[PDB]
Structures are given as C-alpha cells and as structure tokens.
Amino acid sequence: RFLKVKNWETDVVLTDTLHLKSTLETGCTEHICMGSIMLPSVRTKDQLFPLAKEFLDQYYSSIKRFGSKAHMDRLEEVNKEIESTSTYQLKDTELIYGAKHAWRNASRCVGRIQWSKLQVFDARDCTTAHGMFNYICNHVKYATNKGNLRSAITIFPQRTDGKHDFRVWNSQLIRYAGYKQPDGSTLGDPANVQFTEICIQQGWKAPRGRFDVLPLLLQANGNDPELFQIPPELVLEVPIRHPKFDWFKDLGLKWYGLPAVSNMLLEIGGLEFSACPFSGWYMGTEIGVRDYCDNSRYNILEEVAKKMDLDMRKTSSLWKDQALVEINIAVLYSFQSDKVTIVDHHSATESFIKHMENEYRCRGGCPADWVWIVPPMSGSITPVFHQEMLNYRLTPSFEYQPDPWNTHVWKG
Amino acid sequence: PRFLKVKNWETDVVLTDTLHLKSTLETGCTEHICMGSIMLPSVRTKDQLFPLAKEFLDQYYSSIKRFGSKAHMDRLEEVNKEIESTSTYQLKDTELIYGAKHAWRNASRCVGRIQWSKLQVFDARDCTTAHGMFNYICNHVKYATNKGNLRSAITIFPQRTDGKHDFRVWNSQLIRYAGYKQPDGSTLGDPANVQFTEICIQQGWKAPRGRFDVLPLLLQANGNDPELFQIPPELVLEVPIRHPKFDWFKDLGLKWYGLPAVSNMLLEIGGLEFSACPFSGWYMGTEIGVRDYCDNSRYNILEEVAKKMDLDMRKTSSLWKDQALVEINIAVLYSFQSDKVTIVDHHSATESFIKHMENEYRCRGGCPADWVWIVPPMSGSITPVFHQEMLNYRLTPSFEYQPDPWNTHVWKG
Numbered sequence: 151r152f153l154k155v156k157n158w159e160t161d162v163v164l165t166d167t168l169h170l171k172s173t174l175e176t177g178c179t180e181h182i183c184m185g186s187i188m189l190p191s192v193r194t195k196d197q198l199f200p201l202a203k204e205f206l207d208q209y210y211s212s213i214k215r216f217g218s219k220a221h222m223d224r225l226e227e228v229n230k231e232i233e234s235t236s237t238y239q240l241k242d243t244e245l246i247y248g249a250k251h252a253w254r255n256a257s258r259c260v261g262r263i264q265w266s267k268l269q270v271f272d273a274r275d276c277t278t279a280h281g282m283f284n285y286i287c288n289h290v291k292y293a294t295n296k297g298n299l300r301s302a303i304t305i306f307p308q309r310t311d312g313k314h315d316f317r318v319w320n321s322q323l324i325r326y327a328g329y330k331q332p333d334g335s336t337l338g339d340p341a342n343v344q345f346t347e348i349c350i351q352q353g354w355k356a357p358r359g360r361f362d363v364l365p366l367l368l369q370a371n372g373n374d375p376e377l378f379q380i381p382p383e384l385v386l387e388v389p390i391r392h393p394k395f396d397w398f399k400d401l402g403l404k405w406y407g408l409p410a411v412s413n414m415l416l417e418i419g420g421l422e423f424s425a426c427p428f429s430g431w432y433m434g435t436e437i438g439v440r441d442y443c444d445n446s447r448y449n450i451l452e453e454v455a456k457k458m459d460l461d462m463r464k465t466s467s468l469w470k471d472q473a474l475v476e477i478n479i480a481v482l483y484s485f486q487s488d489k490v491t492i493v494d495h496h497s498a499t500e501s502f503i504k505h506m507e508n509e510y511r512c513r514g515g516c517p518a519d520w521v522w523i524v525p526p527m528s529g530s531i532t533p534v535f536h537q538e539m540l541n542y543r544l545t546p547s548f549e550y551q552p553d554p555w556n557t558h559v560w561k562g
Numbered sequence: 563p564r565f566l567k568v569k570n571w572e573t574d575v576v577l578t579d580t581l582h583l584k585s586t587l588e589t590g591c592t593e594h595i596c597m598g599s600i601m602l603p604s605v606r607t608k609d610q611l612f613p614l615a616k617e618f619l620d621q622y623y624s625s626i627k628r629f630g631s632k633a634h635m636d637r638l639e640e641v642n643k644e645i646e647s648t649s650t651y652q653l654k655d656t657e658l659i660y661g662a663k664h665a666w667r668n669a670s671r672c673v674g675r676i677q678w679s680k681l682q683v684f685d686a687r688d689c690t691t692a693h694g695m696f697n698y699i700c701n702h703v704k705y706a707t708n709k710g711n712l713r714s715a716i717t718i719f720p721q722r723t724d725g726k727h728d729f730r731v732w733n734s735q736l737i738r739y740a741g742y743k744q745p746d747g748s749t750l751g752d753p754a755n756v757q758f759t760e761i762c763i764q765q766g767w768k769a770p771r772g773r774f775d776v777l778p779l780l781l782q783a784n785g786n787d788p789e790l791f792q793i794p795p796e797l798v799l800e801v802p803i804r805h806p807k808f809d810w811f812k813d814l815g816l817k818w819y820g821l822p823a824v825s826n827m828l829l830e831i832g833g834l835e836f837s838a839c840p841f842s843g844w845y846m847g848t849e850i851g852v853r854d855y856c857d858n859s860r861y862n863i864l865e866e867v868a869k870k871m872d873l874d875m876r877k878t879s880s881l882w883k884d885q886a887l888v889e890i891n892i893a894v895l896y897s898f899q900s901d902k903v904t905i906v907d908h909h910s911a912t913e914s915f916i917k918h919m920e921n922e923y924r925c926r927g928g929c930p931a932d933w934v935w936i937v938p939p940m941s942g943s944i945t946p947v948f949h950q951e952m953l954n955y956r957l958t959p960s961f962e963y964q965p966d967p968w969n970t971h972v973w974k975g
C-alpha cells in the first residue's frame with residue numbers, strides 16, 4: 151500500500167504514495183496483467199457531485215486554501231448548480247488547472263517535465279464548425295510559432311446530454327491521407343485510409359498524393375461535421391534529408407512539424423470535453439521509427455536499406471537496424487536544420503527521469519506506462535528502460551473515445 | 563472474463579485467451595495499479611501440498627491421454643498416502659520431465675519457448691554432496707555446449723524437504739565473469755558479479771583479477787556450507803569478438819562465453835520445490851551486445867566503441883550511441899556465427915516467438931507472456947513482438963526467483 155520503485159542502473163529507490171488517490175480501474179486483475187493492451191476494456195447528477203467535489207478539493211488544496219470559506223462556497227455553488235442545471239461550469243482558473251493536470255497525469259506521455267507551461271485556449275464560447283475552424287487555425291499558428299513550438303490545448307464546450315457533442319473527427323489536426331489502390335497497395339498513410347474515405351464521402355476533393363495534408367472535419371453542437379482546409383501557410387512541413395547520404399532526399403520524404411492529438415476526451419471534475427485538441431513537439435522516434443518504419447505505416451526500411459546497399463539476404467546482418475538508425479539521424483537533422491523543435495529519445499527520456507524524481511519528491515509519485523515511455527528504438531540505452539514504473543489513473547485525465555463515425559446519428 | 567482478446571496492431575490478428583483461467587498465483591497487480599515493469603513484485607504443509615500435487619497429476623495424466631484411468635487414480639492414491647505419511651512425495655521420472663518442460667513452456671519472460679518440447683532433462687535427484695553436484699554440472703555443460711552446436715538442458719537436484727537441507731548453486735549462472743571493485747572505485751570485469759566474486763574470494767578462490775575471468779562454481783549440497791570448484795577450462799567454450807568490417811574491433815579485447823546457463827531459479831512442480839535446477843539454451847545476440855556490453859552498470863563499452871568509430875559525440879542527437887550499439891551487435895552475431903556457436907538474432911527470435919504464441923493460442927488456449935521482457939532492448943518496434951498484445955499470468959509448473967543464499971544461509975562453520 152506504499153509502493154517502492156527501483157532504478158536498476160542507479161539503484162535509486164523512490165516511494166509511491168500518490169497511487170492511493172487512483173480512481174478508475176487499470177485493466178489488470180490479481181490473476182492477469184494487461185500492461186501491454188492498448189485499449190483495455192453522460193453522467194447522472196449523483197455521479198457528478200462526488201467527481202466535482204473530488205476535483206474542487208484538489209484545486210483548493212493546490213492554491214493553499216483547502217477548507218477555506220472560498221472553498222466551501224464554491225462547493226456549495228457547484229452543488230446548487232448541478233442540482234438545478236444537471237451540470238456545471240468551471241471557472242477559467244479551474245479549467246486551466248484541470249487541463250495542466252490532465253497532462254501531468256498522462257501516464258503514456260514522456261514530455262511531462264513541461265506540464266505546467268501549457269497554453270490553454272478556452273473555446274467554450276464556440277457554437278459552430280466555422281468557429282471551430284478559426285479556433286484551430288489560431289491554435290496551430292500559436293503552437294507552431296515559426297518553428298519554435300509551444301505547447302497548447304484548445305477546449306471546446308463540454309458534453310451536455312450527449313446529443314450536442316463537439317468533436318474533431320481527425321485523429322490529429324495535421325495528418326496525411328491514405329488511399330487504397332486498384333493494385334491492392336496503399337498510397338500515403340495507411341493509418342488514415344478510413345478517415346480519408348469519410349472525407350471524400352463528405353465532399354473532399356482528394357489530390358491523391360503520398361503526403362496530402364488532410365482537411366479538418368469538424369462537428370459542432372451534435373450537428374453533422376463539415377470540412378475545412380487548414381491554411382497551407384499554417385502547416386509547417388520539413389523535407390527529410392540525411393547529413394551524409396545525398397541520395398536520401400530523393401526518397402521524397404517529408405513530415406509535418408506539429409503533432410496535435412485531436413481525438414481524445416478531457417475529463418475535469420466529472421465534466422467531459424470531447425473536443426480538446428492539444429499539441430507539443432515531436433520526439434524523433436515517433437516519425438523515424440513508427441510513422442516511417444512500421445510495416446503498416448510508410449514502411450520504408452527496405453527502400454532505405456537497398457539504397458545503403460546493406461546485406462539483406464539475412465536478418466543477422468542487422469540491416470533493418472542499421473537503416474533504422476540512419477532514418478532517425480535524418481529526421482532529427484532535417485528538423486534541426488530547418489529550426490523546427492524536435493527532441494531526440496535520449497534527451498527526452500533523461501528529462502522524464504528528472505521529472506519522475508521531481509514528481510516523486512513533490513507529489514509522492516508519477517503514474518507512468520513503461521510500455522509507452524520506453525522508445526521503440528534503443529530501449530535499454532535510455533534510462534527509462536532501467537526504471538520501474540507504476541501505471542495508475544488519476545483525474546483530471548485524457549481518455550480515449552469511440553471514433554465518432556461509429557456513433558454519430560447523421561441528420562442529413 | 564472467460565474470454566480475453568489480445569490484438570496484434572500490425573496484422574489485426576485477434577487471438578482469444580482461455581488459458582488464464584487456469585492461472586494459479588498472482589502478478590503484484592491490483593485492480594487500481596499495474597506493476598507490469600517491476601522486476602521482483604509481490605516449506606509447504608501437507609494441507610497445502612495435496613491439492614498442488616493433484617492439480618499437477620491431473621495435468622500430467624490429461625497430457626498423456628489417460629485422464630481418469632486406473633493408473634491415474636492409483637497414482638493419486640499413492641501420492642496422497644506418501645504425503646500423509648512422509649510429508650513430501652517423489653515424482654516419477656516421466657512426471658519430472660513433463661514438469662520441467664512445462665515450467666519452460668510457462669515461463670512468461672522467455673522468448674525462446676518455441677523450443678520448449680526439446681529440453682534434455684538430467685535427473686540429479688540421487689545427488690548428496692557438492693562434489694556430486696560439480697560432476698553433474700560438468701556433464702550438463704559438456705552435453706549442452708556440444709562443441710558449439712548448443713542443446714537445451716536442465717539438471718535437477720533434490721527437492722526441498724524441511725528448508726534446512728537445500729541444494730543451491732550460489733552462482734547466478736554456471737558460467738559468468740568475475741567482477742572486482744577497485745580502491746579508485748572503478749570495476750574490473752563484470753560489475754554484476756562483484757558481490758559473488760567477493761564471496762568466492764572469501765571462500766578461498768585465487769582470483770586472476772582480469773577482465774574476463776570465469777568464476778568458480780560455489781555449490782551447496784544438503785544444506786551444507788558451499789564448496790568451490792573450478793569448471794575445467796576445456797569445457798568452457800568462449801568466443802573472441804570481432805567485426806566483419808572494423809579490424810580495430812578485435813583490439814577492444816572483447817570475448818564472451820557461449821553457454822548461458824541460469825543457475826539461481828527455483829523450479830516448482832506439483833507443489834515440490836527444486837532449489838537447484840540450472841538450465842541452459844543459447845544466446846539471443848542482444849543479451850550480450852546490448853545488455854552485457856552496453857548497460858552502464860555492466861561492461862559499458864559504448865563510448866570506447868563510438869570514439870574508435872569517430873562518431874560525433876558532442877550531441878546525443880547524432881545518435882552516436884545508437885550507431886555504436888548496432889555495430890557491436892553485428893560483431894557479436896558475426897563472431898559466434900563464424901566460430902559456429904549457436905546464437906540467434908532478435909529478428910529471428912521474435913518472429914519465431916510470434917509463431918509459437920499463435921500456435922499456443924490455438925492448441926493450448928493461451929500463452930502467458932511478459933511484454934516488458936519479450937520485446938528486445940534495441941530496435942523494439944521493428945520486431946513483431948512490439949506490436950503484439952500479451953497477457954501475463956502465472957501457470958505451474960514454473961520457474962521462480964529465490965533470494966540469494968548468502969542472505970539466508972545458516973553457516974555451519
């Protein structure tokens with residue numbers, strides 16, 4: 151019930167008490183660990199007040215006014231409001247604190263050393279999809295910042311009766327399209343094939359290239375979603391070259407500078423924010439290892455290996471591994487040279503370790519999902535590989551949610 | 563949850579696990595905490611032993627298609643009387659073989675399990691002394707090494723009785739290199755074995771004090787104080803490490819042993835506890851080239867290799883570490899293959915494991931696996947295992963951790 155975590159390179163041991171404040175289930179039971187499962191599985195008035203109270207208590211505790219008249223007044227006010235209006239509204243301060251802490255609590259995010267510097271854009275006054283498009287352009291421009299990226303979240307109106315949800319249908323603000331071809335193959339990004347079909351279905355005139363920035367498909371107030379194209383001038387892209395291989399540029403590879411997860415649900419004080427796109431900056435392996443080398447993504451390893459002239463007749467030459475490293479040298483070098491913020495996995499993981507220690511010291515723990523935190527290349531040469539971690543759910547939190555095309559009731 | 567789906571995210575293959583229902587002990591996980599990445603998480607009375615014996619013999623008799631037979635029922639009766647009467651019981655030879663193979667089959671951290679049915683079991687339960695253990699252990703090493711054509715094997719010494727007569731191999735592996743902490747605070751040899759090296763020296767080992775000294779065996783029989791033995795050098799197969807392109811690599815002075823033989827685990831079969839049960843297969847290359855060589859707390863050669871490669875070591879963003887890691891691993895696989903010592907690369911190993919795993923779902927209803935351990939410590943997502951959801955749970959028979967015996971041993975003098 152007070153749990154210890156050990157680092158096996160440094161022999162440092164930290165003691166976790168924060169996990170006792172953990173709310174929802176993990177997936178795992180006593181007889182079965184589901185640690186490697188990616189997805190392991192509206193609120194009534196009575197459901198909402200304990201949640202609201204739980205949140206408000208931590209808010210007022212953070213500003214050193216726990217048990218104050220200010221605290222008791224707010225709790226009563228919110229209580230009155232849920233009783234009468236079946237939901238409630240957060241003050242701006244509570245929204246900002248909640249969104250920062252959702253990030254602070256995000257156990258799969260290696261970038262949390264930065265958690266308190268989040269720029270929060272309150273888009274709760276938004277009513278239409280054009281409003282949504284304007285908010286998002288402003289977010290994209292604020293966050294990109296000419297290549298000197300800055301973290302931000304834009305929060306649209308909270309779910310009410312579940313029939314007036316705001317959603318961004320995209321999985322990220324900026325992603326490339328995918329097209330299934332007549333020769334069975336895939337052009338562009340296979341991750342996005344379905345969402346691209348939905349765009350075309352809804353009107354999008356697809357260019358049918360490899361790196362087509364997808365349009366935004368935005369749903370306001372439960373209405374049917376509408377398409378909008380992000381101003382091209384707002385989408386910073388980086389062309390991929392290698393400092394030593396002149397032929398690399400001829401692979402014709404680019405990637406975008408701004409990672410902006412847009413399909414998650416932000417839960418604060420029981421309230422549910424279904425449209426809450428957020429952005430930081432890339433760790434290099436995200437692009438070089440996963441986006442480029444997953445067999446089900448752009449799957450370029452063989453192409454690169456061939457051009458490096460590696461011995462590909464046997465796995466034990468480690469040609470896959472040699473290519474992977476060079477692909478990742480190229481990503482990093484390309485971003486650095488264009489002056490676009492990017493972090494390498496060594497620097498990223500060392501910062502997370504420093505953050506874990508800070509968090510253990512000042513908060514009594516840090517929920518972390520080892521499976522996600524350890525990079526997909528060179529695991530054991532990063533310090534996080536050697537670090538025991540405890541994954542648990544704290545609120546406020548970011549949550550996965552059903553893709554909306556599986557759920558939406560098309561009015562037409 | 564009589565049915566649990568796991569998905570592969572590359573192929574969309576979904577497999578259904580029913581085997582977890584037969585899961586015995588626990589994981590250290592509760593409903594509100596996942597300790598997936600914790601390395602060591604949280605004598606038997608008659609009461610406790612007969613169900614464990616029954617459970618196991620039901621499994622054994624079921625596997626040989628004689629469940630419920632007179633032979634099955636007679637054996638249950640015979641074991642039951644033996645426990646009641648003597649407090650323990652003895653496994654038949656066939657049952658011990660079945661048990662040992664099944665502990666391997668069930669070992670959730672082992673990527674080598676496609677081979678589980680081919681284990682050579684050496685029955686050492688007639689052993690009474692440490693010199694006896696040394697002889698058995700020598701025979702295991704020679705059989706398993708097989709001049710470089712490695713064969714999986716396990717040697718099983720007598721089981722625990724009262725906890726005061728345990729057989730233990732104090733070595734963590736049968737073959738490992740000594741580590742020596744210097745006065746200036748550096749380490750010569752393998753830092754993982756400093757404590758054990760010190761114990762050996764205390765017991766009378768004359769340490770050559772080099773970087774790659776094969777440790778002596780420290781063997782406890784029947785609860786007695788352990789005794790030292792040198793494994794005959796002729797039986798210890800080693801491989802000097804060189805690179806197919808970099809001729810300066812050999813001058814790093816690197817070598818490694820060919821036989822990985824874990825000697826400090828406990829084998830549980832039918833409730834019985836076998837505290838000395840060394841086993842050996844063959845290396846996956848990343849064990850040596852990523853962990854043994856490049857862990858900071860091991861030989862830590864990454865810098866020296868990168869300097870000699872003249873990589874840009876000013877900025878981690880050159881990925882010099884990653885570049886060196888790969889060349890070192892090329893060198894390990896090259897060196898073993900050239901000398902004809904069995905070794906498997908992490909692509910082949912992981913591809914084979916996914917096949918093994920799918921086959922186990924279909925024929926067994928499951929395959930417990932620990933993703934944290936199965937995914938290799940380099941190039942993770944370019945191996946198929948990374949993309950595979952895995953369920954970790956404990957089946958018996960099993961291999962278990964046990965405390966180091968210097969921590970528990972009652973010295974006779």
Ligand code: HEM
Binds near residue numbers: 253259261262303498
């Ligand atoms: C500022 C620099 C940031 C860095 C370097 C970073 C890094 C990462 C990485 C590498 C992942 C794993 C991504 C993947 O494998 O797809 C991740 C996941 C995640 N991050 Fe961050 N991140 C940053 C900013 C943020 C921000 C601003 C938020 C929220 C406000 C956030 C919340 C999350 C969440 C909820 C996940 C899980 C995503 C999922 O399950 O798909 N991160 N982060």
Ligand code: HEM
Binds near residue numbers: 662715841843846935
């Ligand atoms: C035959 C070829 C084999 C291969 C390629 C193989 C591969 C591996 C690897 C790479 C590990 C991780 C080791 C580490 O990180 O230290 C491992 C762990 C393990 N293996 Fe195997 N293995 C083989 C044979 C065996 C045998 C014969 C047994 C038992 C009879 C076995 C049982 C285990 C167990 C219990 C672990 C976990 C060890 C621990 O917890 O420290 N393996 N295996």
Ligand SMILES: C[C@H](O)[C@H](O)[C@H]1CNc2nc(N)[nH]c(=O)c2N1
Binds near residue numbers: 535599600
């Ligand atoms: C803390 C973490 O569990 C630890 O470093 C684990 C990671 N995964 C592992 N995987 C293998 N195969 N061997 C190990 O020693 C480790 N150690």
Ligand SMILES: C[C@H](O)[C@H](O)[C@H]1CNc2nc(N)[nH]c(=O)c2N1
Binds near residue numbers: 186522523948
């Ligand atoms: C099956 C396994 O959960 C899956 O492939 C996970 C592994 N760890 C991950 N880690 C990160 N950061 N991102 C991912 O998408 C994955 N996917």
Ligand SMILES: N=C(NO)NCCC[C@H](N)C(=O)O
Binds near residue numbers: 261410411436
């Ligand atoms: N660093 C971040 N967020 O700030 N990553 C978000 C997920 C991005 C996704 N992994 C990609 O490679 O496109």
Ligand SMILES: N=C(NO)NCCC[C@H](N)C(=O)O
Binds near residue numbers: 846
């Ligand atoms: N492949 C096996 N056994 O067959 N490994 C046993 C553990 C060896 C340990 N990882 C080492 O690098 O020495």
Ligand SMILES: [Zn+2]
Binds near residue numbers: 178591596597
């Ligand atoms: Zn778990």
